[PDB]
Structures are given as structure tokens and as C-alpha cells.
Amino acid sequence: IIGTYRLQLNKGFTFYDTIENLDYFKELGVSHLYLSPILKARPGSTHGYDVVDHSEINEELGGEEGYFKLVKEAKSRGLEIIQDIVPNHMAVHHTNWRLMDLLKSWKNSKYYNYFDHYDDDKIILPILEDELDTVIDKGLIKLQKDNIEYRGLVLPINDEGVEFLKRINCFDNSCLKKEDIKKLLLMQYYQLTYWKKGYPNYRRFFAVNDLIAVRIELDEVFRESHEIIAKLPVDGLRIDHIDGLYNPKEYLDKLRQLVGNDKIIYVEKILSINEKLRDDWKVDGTTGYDFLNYVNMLLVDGSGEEELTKFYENFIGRKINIDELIIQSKKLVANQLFKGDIERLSKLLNVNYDYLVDFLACMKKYRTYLPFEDINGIRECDKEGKLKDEKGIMRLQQYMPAIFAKGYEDTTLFIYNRLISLNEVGSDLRRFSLSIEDFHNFNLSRVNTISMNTLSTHDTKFSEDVRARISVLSEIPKEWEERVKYWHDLLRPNIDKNDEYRFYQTLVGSYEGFDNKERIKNHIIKVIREAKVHTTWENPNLEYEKKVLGFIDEVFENSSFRNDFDNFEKKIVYFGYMKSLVATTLKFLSPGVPDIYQGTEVWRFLLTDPDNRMAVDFRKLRELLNNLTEKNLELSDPRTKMLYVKKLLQLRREYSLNDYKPLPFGFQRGKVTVLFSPIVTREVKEKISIRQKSVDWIRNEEISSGEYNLSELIGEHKVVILTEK
Ligand SMILES: [Mg+2]
């Protein structure tokens, strides 16, 4: 109802670690703690999306005891929970006893249909670090009476294998041959392979072999997998990857039936160019990528579009067309990561493999929702009317988001580097910037929504503050161009200029001094592997990657670069905070519910997961909150941003806001007016009329009715908030 605060739970931050910080959250002003998944995940999981037991609350977080202790402790200071749940899939680990049961007994297992496996004879688990023969030859498979172990993974032995071991009267590695181990493995209901020379014959999360989907569309599977979930004393739920479901609508109807229509439910689901959530999803919105990108585009200055475009082209010496890039990247991922699944979907749907890859690469939204959506939702890419089997399309719909996500989010976003502050999850790189009236129209359609407004998550490519700095370049492209050409002649890098160009922008976004350089180094390596041009996760080009790492060591080692960059960067950083405050105000005061990624209630520069997964120093945040004040804060002081978070969450509790009236450079909701300027490096020339005695809500300094320059109202921060009386 007022604000959500996302916490990344794990062993290093447990239910008890949360309990210690409840007074902080309360005083910050937030109403809901937005908890990461809490069912038992693999031991040591830093994130909890690799579920291994549906019927138990993760002991590494505090177990069932800690959770209810947390909840009751939290409610006792007006804090509610929105609990992240993961319906679609589980992890291949021995701690997943349901899955082990299927591996042991196959058709005799009650969990035979709980898992989305393709074939009825075997399951192929491409999880070996080497060829099976090599693994065996190295003796990396340890035998017991009734189980094998590989790299700490325990898998059971079926009846036939155990009969074999009794025949040869041998139950450890000492009393049998390598070809005996071989024979034993070949007769297991599971067949282990090298992770690169095997297609899984089961449905995954995207292309993650470790994760196998559960068949929640079957009513027994849904009941069992939501047994603990249904008992949770929580105000709300967030649904991970709902687009993976065979029938999301049916799933939401059963979830609503289960936990009642009063709970707040958000879905993780990426919306495209004009899409909205299905009317019949009894759901209160998404986690807010739509909002994020609307603000994100608004922060970008349109007048720099042509110049940034032409320089990018000139600097890499290659023109890049975005629509072809998107298309080729989806086709790249279809063939590289999902060839096995698309081969099967071709046979199921009676089409040629290429036509089907062409169709998936054509889809302009993440997926269609037959049998509820009409068949003409696939009409436009199925130009030849080949796709007709309803259930086949229903089946295909489960893979459609994986092509969009892996092709656009995890490939295109790491290649088209014109201005990477835009390369975000849920973005549309076909557009560049957005207007205030565009922003108003977006809000107008959401005036009564409680959907999340967020600018940073555990999956966003960057934190909001990283994007705010890089977007400043759009306002000063000429100066930007000068710097890059000098840096490029100064350093003489033996690498792809697209990688080099990428790096510079990343430094601009994330600069906190020329130390701690392993973060940017690891990130850039991740970037170019995602890009899939000179290297990949499956086949790292160690020779190229070393050139890239060499370049970055040279950079941090070049006094001329450091001094030049440092001086350019002072401007960026100064203007970036401004954009960040504008965005921040927009997040708390637009229609919808504002979300806070842990630690980002102050300045915080996070790159891509896993960099955005670093520990948050709550002790420090508490000390800042303790010493909070409204004068004379340096813009770059962390208390400046925290001040906004605390005062706008507070605003949310005292002033009614259900109302939205657009202004040329702001908007009104009740007795609240927001005035801002997304452009920050140039003085805004506008007259503004304050009709009535108002209060600067951050400064608590009354402003009297009258005409004003806008530049005087918004001052250094580029945003003001006015309340009446
Ligand atoms: Mg995710």
C-alpha cells in the first residue's frame, strides 16, 4: 500500500538478520518487506530460485521458526511481507528428494509426472564437467550400496543397478572395474553426459540444465508444491517467471482460490510496446519493468540522438541496425541453446525447424496466451498459417519467453552500445528517448494501479544510479566524443572497439575511484560472453579475454587517462545525482507502489548480477538514517538520496494521492505538485505559477503563491515537491 523493500535473503542475511533491521525499515517509512524465495533451496544458494523442497522453509535462512518469528516481529511494527515464490521449476540436486525418487523409480515414482520430462524411457542430465568416459577414468564417480556421487552430487541407484552390484558382490570403488561403473551408469533411468555434448530431454528454466520445470498445470502438482506457500502468514505474493506456465490464468485462479482475493499479487512478467496484463489475471500488477523503462527513456535527452548514433557508428567503423540485431540474436540463441527443444516443437507442430526458429525470432512480445488469446496473436509471424494445433501452440508458448529473454535481454543488450544506460531489462532499444507527455500518458493509464514502480532489481543490467550517470552523455555528446577519441588515441587497445566503447561507458556509470577494478573486469568479461561474438560461456576465448583484461589493467595504470577521466567524471557524477533524484521522486510519487532494491535508498552503483548481489551494509545505512537532516547536505552525500526516500514514503502516508493531473513540467495529485526537469545540464526556461501558499516538502520551507522561473524552483536537484498549507 505504501512501499516495498526488496531483501536478498541467504546465509549471509537470514530471517534473524532481517529481524535486527526491522526498526530501520519501519523508520525508513516502508510498509512491506519484499522477501526473496524461502522454500528450501540448494545448500549455499545465494538467491533461493533453485528450489529443492516445496514442503519445507529453508533452514539456512532460519527455518520455519525464524520465518514466523520474523513475520510476527515484523507485523508488530506495521511491516507486512510480500513473499517471492517460484512455481515453475526446481533444481537438480540430491536434496530434491522428489526428483531423486523419479531418478530411482521412474514410472514407479509418484513424482513421475511432477516433473516436465520429455521421454518415458530415460532422462538425459547434461551435468558432467567432462565426457562420461573421462569422468570415470579420472575416478570422479564414487560408488556406494545404493547411490553414486559426482562432485558432491548424490544420485540413487535403481533396482537393476543394485541387482548388478549384488551379482558382482561389490559396493565400493575398490572391488570393480571402470567398465563395471560404465555398465552401472548405462542402466540408470538417468543418463549423465558432458554438459556440452548433450541436449536435456526435459524442460528447463531457459537454458539452465540445473533447473527442471514442474508440471503445475496438473492439479496434484500445484497442491503439493503450494502446501507451505498456502500456510504462509503473508500479505502478498510475487510470482517468478509466470510466463513459463502452461496455463498462467488457470494457475492464478487456483492461487486466488488458495490464498484468497485479498492478498496482493505481483507477477514477474515483461511487457512489450503496447501490451498489458490480461484482464482475467486476478493479479495486481508486475514488479515494474514497464515503469522502470518509461522513466529510463525519459532521462535520456533526445537532442543527442543523432550525434551519439553517428559517433557510435564511426567509432566502431560498422553500422549496426537494431531490428536485424534483435532478430539475429534470437536466432543465434534458438540454435545455440535451444536447438533440441525447437527440434521437438517442430515435430509436435508439424513444421520445418527453420520456419519455427524464424517465427520465434519474429515474436514481438514475450509470449501469446492461447487458449484465451485469439489465434491471430501468432498470425503476424506465422505468415503462412502453419501453426494450428492449439495444444502445440500452448506448448510452444512455454518456450517463447526463453527466446525473447535470452536473445534480447542476454544478447542484444550487450552488443548495441550506442548508449547503454538504455540497455535494460524490459527496454525497447528501437526507441531512444521519451517525452514528458509520453510519460504523462503512461501514468494516465495507470492512475489507480498498485503495480510496482521500480528502477533497480536483482536482475536489472544496472542499478538506477549507474544508468543516471551514463544518460548524462546524451546531453553532452560533443564533449563525450572528444574524451573518447583522446582515450582511444592515448590507450591503443588491441581489442574490438565495441568492447572498448562498452568499457568507457561502464566506467562512466560505475566510477568510484581507480581501485576495486576486479568488479568492472569481471563484468566486462561477462558482457562479452553474453554478446557471444568473440567468446562464450560454453567456449571462453581465453586469448581474447586476456587482451581485454590487459587493456583494463593498462587503463587503471595510465596516469594520463586517470587524470583526464577523473576530471570529465566530476561533471557526470554531479549531473547524474540530479537525474537520480528526478527518477527517485517519479518513482515514489507516480501512480503505483514504489519499490526499493536493498541498499539503493542511497547512491549505489551496481552492475549486472552477480555484481548487484553484493552484501548491503545495513549497519552503515542505520548510522546515516540516525544522522539524517535537511541542511546543508552535499548533493553527493548519501543522506541526500535517503532524505528523499524517507520524506516521500512519509508523504505517501499523510497526503492522499489518488489523482493525476499532468503539467508541462510536472503533475498534480491532490494537494501535491511535482515539478521537475529531466534535462539537467542546461537551465530550464519556463514560467511557473504557484496559485497558493505551498511547502517545499524536502526543505520544509514555505513558498508563497506567485509566478516563478522553473530553474529557481528546482534549483540544484532539478526537482521540487510542493504541498498546500
Ligand atoms: Mg528473474
Side-chain angles (χ1 to χ4, degrees):
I1 334 168
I2 274 133
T4 57
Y5 195 108
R6 172 77 187 207
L7 291 167
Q8 293 288 112
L9 305 172
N10 50 59
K11 301 165 74 185
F13 198 83
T14 68
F15 303 142
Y16 296 111
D17 294 313
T18 310
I19 279 166
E20 190 185 81
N21 292 289
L22 291 189
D23 286 324
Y24 171 81
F25 297 144
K26 185 55 193 173
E27 195 200 327
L28 192 58
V30 127
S31 57
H32 287 66
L33 306 188
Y34 171 20
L35 301 181
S36 61
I38 53 130
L39 303 184
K40 186 184 181 184
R42 280 185 294 198
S45 170
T46 69
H47 55 75
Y49 293 99
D50 46 341
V51 192
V52 296
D53 195 357
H54 289 140
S55 66
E56 187 173 299
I57 294 179
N58 200 319
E59 284 304 319
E60 303 192 351
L61 298 179
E64 183 178 65
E65 184 187 336
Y67 194 66
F68 280 90
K69 186 46 171 298
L70 169 53
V71 154
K72 138 193 182 68
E73 284 293 293
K75 281 178 187 283
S76 102
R77 53 204 93 188
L79 300 178
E80 298 299 328
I81 299 309
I82 310 295
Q83 184 56 55
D84 199 340
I85 68 184
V86 193
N88 182 76
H89 50 262
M90 303 181 89
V92 185
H93 194 98
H94 37 82
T95 185
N96 187 336
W97 52 266
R98 294 176 176 93
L99 177 63
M100 296 305 97
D101 192 67
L102 170 58
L103 289 194
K104 178 174 67 89
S105 298
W106 198 241
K107 278 173 157 64
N108 293 294
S109 172
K110 72 170 147 298
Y111 291 110
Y112 183 73
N113 275 321
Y114 202 101
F115 295 99
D116 201 341
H117 66 100
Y118 299 159
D119 304 327
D120 64 8
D121 65 317
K122 299 279 184 196
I123 180 172
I124 308 172
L125 307 173
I127 59 182
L128 300 184
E129 296 289 286
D130 279 270
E131 221 71 88
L132 181 48
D133 285 331
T134 299
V135 173
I136 294 178
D137 194 32
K138 287 176 116 295
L140 296 195
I141 294 192
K142 300 210 177 189
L143 168 75
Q144 278 166 13
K145 198 186 195 178
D146 48 28
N147 61 94
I148 64 175
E149 169 169 43
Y150 171 68
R151 296 178 64 81
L153 184 64
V154 177
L155 302 165
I157 310 170
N158 62 9
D159 291 331
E160 200 187 20
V162 173
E163 302 179 26
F164 181 49
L165 292 175
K166 288 198 286 221
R167 280 209 77 105
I168 73 185
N169 193 31
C170 166
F171 316 89
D172 62 280
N173 293 52
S174 67
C175 43
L176 56 62
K177 284 124 225 142
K178 289 186 171 155
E179 79 187 26
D180 291 312
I181 296 176
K182 230 297 182 71
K183 172 154 165 146
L184 180 72
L185 293 171
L186 292 195
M187 78 181 65
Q188 300 308 306
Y189 292 128
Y190 56 95
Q191 297 284 117
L192 314 182
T193 42
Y194 192 20
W195 74 302
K196 312 210 292 184
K197 303 195 77 174
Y199 310 159
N201 64 349
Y202 54 92
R203 180 165 73 90
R204 296 167 281 180
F205 174 70
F206 289 180
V208 186
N209 292 2
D210 271 344
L211 294 171
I212 180 166
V214 309
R215 268 154 67 64
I216 226 175
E217 65 275 30
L218 296 180
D219 176 82
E220 66 275 10
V221 188
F222 170 77
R223 304 265 166 237
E224 189 167 354
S225 53
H226 285 59
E227 255 160 33
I228 294 318
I229 291 171
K231 281 187 193 302
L232 294 186
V234 298
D235 194 35
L237 292 174
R238 170 242 191 227
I239 318 305
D240 182 74
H241 196 53
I242 191 182
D243 274 356
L245 267 34
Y246 187 69
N247 201 326
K249 136 80 168 146
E250 183 180 62
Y251 165 79
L252 296 167
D253 285 352
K254 293 198 182 171
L255 187 71
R256 274 305 180 184
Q257 228 178 328
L258 196 66
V259 304
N261 310 299
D262 266 321
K263 274 17 155 179
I264 296 155
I265 300 173
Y266 296 122
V267 289
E268 187 212 37
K269 184 268 179 296
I270 322 295
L271 284 157
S272 288
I273 192 151
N274 275 316
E275 195 179 5
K276 85 188 193 309
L277 283 195
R278 295 236 131 222
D279 284 349
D280 55 5
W281 291 19
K282 310 175 174 187
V283 130
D284 308 278
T286 74
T287 56
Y289 287 103
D290 47 359
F291 174 90
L292 184 154
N293 287 282
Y294 269 89
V295 185
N296 200 46
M297 287 183 289
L298 181 69
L299 295 200
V300 173
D301 175 7
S303 61
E305 170 162 10
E306 185 161 8
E307 291 166 278
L308 283 188
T309 301
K310 208 236 281 201
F311 176 51
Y312 180 38
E313 299 191 6
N314 293 137
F315 181 78
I316 59 169
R318 162 211 344 178
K319 192 175 183 181
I320 291 182
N321 185 276
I322 171 65
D323 279 284
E324 280 305 334
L325 174 62
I326 296 153
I327 281 169
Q328 65 164 257
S329 294
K330 282 165 191 216
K331 279 181 196 182
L332 174 58
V333 170
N335 290 310
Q336 200 188 260
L337 303 172
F338 303 103
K339 176 155 159 281
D341 297 292
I342 307 186
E343 275 181 341
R344 284 169 198 263
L345 297 163
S346 298
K347 163 163 223 164
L348 172 62
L349 291 158
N350 197 47
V351 300
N352 151 259
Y353 172 93
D354 307 315
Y355 186 86
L356 188 51
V357 167
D358 283 4
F359 173 86
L360 299 161
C362 172
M363 292 289 307
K364 342 217 175 50
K365 62 192 178 172
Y366 271 63
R367 57 167 283 185
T368 58
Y369 298 99
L370 288 283
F372 296 87
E373 187 175 344
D374 189 273
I375 196 66
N376 53 35
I378 73 161
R379 143 77 199 115
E380 170 70 0
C381 298
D382 183 28
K383 298 196 172 77
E384 285 160 55
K386 290 186 177 310
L387 266 40
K388 321 131 165 183
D389 191 48
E390 164 173 277
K391 286 168 48 179
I393 304 167
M394 279 186 68
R395 182 46 164 187
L396 175 73
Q397 271 164 186
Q398 291 180 287
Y399 295 73
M400 299 183 182
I403 307 303
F404 202 127
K406 292 307 300 169
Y408 183 85
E409 305 184 36
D410 308 354
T411 311
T412 298
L413 289 191
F414 293 101
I415 287 160
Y416 190 73
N417 294 336
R418 165 170 70 180
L419 181 77
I420 74 192
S421 62
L422 288 171
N423 303 28
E424 195 43 278
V425 164
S427 68
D428 189 331
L429 289 188
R430 301 152 70 265
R431 327 184 81 77
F432 184 69
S433 156
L434 219 47
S435 78
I436 315 187
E437 80 169 61
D438 292 327
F439 178 75
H440 285 327
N441 285 328
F442 168 73
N443 270 338
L444 283 157
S445 78
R446 321 183 319 120
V447 178
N448 287 338
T449 194
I450 53 183
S451 187
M452 292 181 103
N453 298 338
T454 209
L455 296 156
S456 298
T457 82
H458 56 291
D459 305 320
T460 57
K461 302 306 186 204
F462 305 106
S463 74
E464 57 199 63
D465 282 329
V466 163
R467 306 192 305 268
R469 317 229 276 209
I470 288 165
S471 280
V472 169
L473 308 176
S474 66
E475 300 192 35
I476 55 157
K478 310 188 214 301
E479 302 140 76
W480 171 242
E481 183 166 341
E482 305 175 36
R483 283 316 90 206
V484 172
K485 286 182 313 189
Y486 171 63
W487 300 338
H488 177 80
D489 185 74
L490 172 65
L491 309 151
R492 333 188 288 146
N494 198 21
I495 73 176
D496 190 313
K497 297 229 236 60
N498 209 31
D499 297 352
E500 180 192 349
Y501 200 63
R502 182 88 191 197
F503 169 78
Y504 295 146
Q505 268 176 80
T506 307
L507 196 63
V508 166
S510 59
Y511 186 67
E512 299 190 85
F514 286 105
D515 53 70
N516 197 12
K517 66 167 181 177
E518 284 314 306
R519 286 178 60 222
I520 190 170
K521 284 173 79 190
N522 280 320
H523 170 61
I524 292 299
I525 294 297
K526 157 124 163 174
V527 166
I528 58 161
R529 282 174 194 188
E530 293 285 73
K532 293 160 183 90
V533 187
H534 310 281
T535 188
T536 61
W537 298 101
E538 297 71 22
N539 184 24
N541 187 341
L542 303 174
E543 297 75 30
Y544 186 55
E545 286 175 9
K546 224 59 205 186
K547 283 200 291 293
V548 170
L549 298 158
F551 161 66
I552 301 186
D553 293 339
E554 273 160 16
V555 166
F556 278 65
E557 223 148 38
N558 187 292
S559 60
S560 291
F561 182 84
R562 293 162 99 274
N563 292 325
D564 189 87
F565 190 84
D566 195 80
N567 256 314
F568 182 68
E569 188 67 353
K570 275 169 184 168
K571 329 297 184 310
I572 300 298
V573 167
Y574 180 69
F575 291 128
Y577 296 127
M578 301 173 189
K579 288 191 182 294
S580 188
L581 290 185
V582 169
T584 294
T585 294
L586 265 37
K587 178 176 70 161
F588 288 94
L589 291 195
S590 299
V593 169
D595 178 37
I596 300 169
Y597 189 53
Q598 57 168 24
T600 61
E601 67 272 47
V602 301
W603 317 124
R604 189 169 211 230
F605 309 86
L606 304 177
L607 311 163
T608 306
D609 174 14
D611 185 71
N612 67 13
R613 306 306 175 89
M614 297 183 303
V616 162
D617 187 13
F618 290 99
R619 289 178 50 232
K620 198 228 187 322
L621 294 175
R622 264 186 270 150
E623 174 176 39
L624 291 176
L625 184 54
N626 259 66
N627 298 322
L628 204 65
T629 193
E630 326 157 4
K631 309 185 68 169
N632 286 76
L633 294 190
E634 295 297 308
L635 178 53
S636 65
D637 184 322
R639 290 178 289 171
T640 292
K641 186 178 186 190
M642 176 181 290
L643 181 53
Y644 276 69
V645 177
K646 170 150 153 43
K647 267 179 165 308
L648 298 176
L649 279 174
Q650 192 205 354
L651 194 53
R652 281 184 72 78
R653 300 180 168 269
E654 285 159 28
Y655 288 70
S656 193
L657 289 166
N658 49 271
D659 189 30
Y660 188 91
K661 162 188 158 68
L663 301 184
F665 271 55
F667 58 87
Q668 293 184 347
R669 323 187 69 195
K671 312 203 134 151
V672 193
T673 302
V674 177
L675 303 160
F676 67 92
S677 163
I679 301 319
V680 299
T681 65
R682 308 186 292 278
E683 184 154 347
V684 172
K685 294 235 192 132
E686 292 179 304
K687 276 315 185 179
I688 273 307
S689 293
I690 316 295
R691 305 325 187 78
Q692 34 192 54
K693 178 175 292 307
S694 299
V695 190
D696 180 348
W697 175 269
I698 256 75
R699 295 197 57 91
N700 194 52
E701 302 180 322
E702 87 162 67
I703 298 146
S704 180
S705 72
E707 287 197 20
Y708 293 83
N709 317 270
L710 187 67
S711 80
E712 186 147 6
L713 271 171
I714 59 174
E716 185 162 68
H717 290 185
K718 300 315 181 288
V719 54
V720 282
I721 303 91
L722 314 169
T723 78
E724 296 190 39
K725 211 207 314 156

